[PDB]
């Protein structure tokens, strides 16, 4: 028996505070969030079919204060519907508060609040880029193992009103049919290559014709005409993805047929980017709410 | 009222307006390099796996 209203209240209590104020939930409550959310993920499709209106967010990377700024601007659930593109943990100070609030909202509003998998929602990246260390410092390694189990069930892509294709990274040379995404079974780890790896790892690249190599050392880059062909074939208008910090929080590609969204401003204290969020209304009209960098 | 199911997409042009120089050419190049340096998660996948492996062989 898990008290979701109390979990949310407590997480939301730091709303006015100076950036970095911790919220201390109980270990069992955090496990509850993982178990209950894992259950919901598995019971909904791996390829979400969603209706507008909704707000779409990119990377947060444990920037909890900034997560609260986003809800402030866009409306706390259920005032607005949300789709997040992944990368909730790692890099930042407060991965735990960040994922916990998102997991709690998933449980509270399971058909109005959505979370896709990013490349950081993966043990191979999590061990090293902060989340494991955070779990160990504040609780134990066992909690990290529980999170891993939850992450392995996250959905992988969403289609908004049959027009906007959303995933964390981008396209795959192996993505020929939407059914291929639907066929992926969960729980699953992220493979080193192939469809699932590309959906979470690939990048658009202006200078690449077709499919090219990725400086990351994982997956590929794809050119503009690849995006154009894909939208044409599958009768879509836009690809929406995250995965790369961008100076203004959002950035267009291939004559506006793809957009990159990144929601953490002042990214990990290393960049001075803005963060953005995309508002999609009922007629599929898209607008951007910017979180400006520190003045 | 849920939005899980299982129109034509336009842009708010007033919102794009509200939200290149050789001197700006440099700033962009430096960001691109900063970003490429930052995204090295590929370098450590093997390591992370081995770490997970031996933490298992602990028991
Ligand atoms: Mn990513």
Swiss-Prot record, chain A:
Chief site of localization: cytoplasm
Name this polypeptide is given: Serine/threonine-protein phosphatase PP1-gamma catalytic subunit
Active site: 120
UniProt binding sites for Mn(2+) 1: 59, 61, 87
Subunit structure: PP1 comprises a catalytic subunit, PPP1CA, PPP1CB or PPP1CC, which is folded into its native form by inhibitor 2 and glycogen synthetase kinase 3, and then complexed to one or several targeting or regulatory subunits. PPP1R12A, PPP1R12B and PPP1R12C mediate binding to myosin. PPP1R3A (in skeletal muscle), PPP1R3B (in sliver), PPP1R3C, PPP1R3D and PPP1R3F (in brain) mediate binding to glycogen. PPP1R15A and PPP1R15B mediate binding to EIF2S1. Part of a complex containing PPP1R15B, PP1 and NCK1/2. Interacts with PPP1R3B, PPP1R7 and CDCA2. Isoform 2 interacts with SPZ1.
CDD domains to which the protein is assigned, alphabetical: MPP_PP1_PPKL
Free-text tissue specificity from the UniProt record: Isoform 2 is expressed only in testis, in the late spermatocytes and early spematids (at protein level).
Chain's role: Protein phosphatase that associates with over 200 regulatory proteins to form highly specific holoenzymes which dephosphorylate hundreds of biological targets. Protein phosphatase 1 (PP1) is essential for cell division, and participates in the regulation of glycogen metabolism, muscle contractility and protein synthesis. Dephosphorylates RPS6KB1. Involved in regulation of ionic conductances and long-term synaptic plasticity. May play an important role in dephosphorylating substrates such as the postsynaptic density-associated Ca(2+)/calmodulin dependent protein kinase II.
SUPFAM superfamilies: Metallo-dependent phosphatases
Homology family: Belongs to the PPP phosphatase family. PP-1 subfamily.
Modification(s) after translation: Phosphorylated by NEK2.
Record carries keyword DNA repair: no
GO CC terms, sorted: chromosome, telomeric region; cleavage furrow; cytoplasm; cytosol; dendritic spine; glutamatergic synapse; kinetochore; microtubule organizing center
Chain positions recorded as Mn(2+) 2 binding sites: 59, 87, 119, 168, 243
Cofactor note: Binds 2 manganese ions per subunit.
UniProt record, GO biological process: blastocyst development; cell division; circadian regulation of gene expression; entrainment of circadian clock by photoperiod; glycogen metabolic process; neuron differentiation; positive regulation of glial cell proliferation; protein dephosphorylation
Curated annotation (Swiss-Prot), chain B:
Spans annotated as Required for binding PPP1CC: 1-6
UniProt keyword annotation of Ligase present: no
GO biological process, one term: glycogen metabolic process
GO MF term list: molecular function inhibitor activity; protein phosphatase inhibitor activity
Signal peptide start and end residues: none
UniProt PTM: Phosphorylation on Ser-8 by ATM activates PP1 by dissociating the PP1-PPP1R2 complex.
Disulfide bonds: none
Ranges where the record places region Required for binding the 'RVXF' binding groove of PPP1CC: 7-19
Record keywords: Acetylation, Carbohydrate metabolism, Glycogen metabolism, Phosphoprotein, Protein phosphatase inhibitor
Compositional bias per record (Basic and acidic residues), positions renumbered to this chain: 22-33
Phosphoserine: residues bearing it: 8, 21
Chain segments carrying region Required for binding PPP1CC catalytic center, displacing metal ions and inhibition of PPP1CC catalytic activity: 38-41
Family statement drawn from the similarity comment of this UniProt entry: Belongs to the protein phosphatase inhibitor 2 family.
Quaternary assembly: Heterodimer with PP1.
Function of the protein: Inhibitor of protein-phosphatase 1.
Protein name listed in UniProt: Protein phosphatase inhibitor 2
Lineage: Eukaryota, Metazoa, Chordata, Craniata, Vertebrata
Gene encoding the protein: Ppp1r2
Full protein segment contained here: 12 to 169 of 206
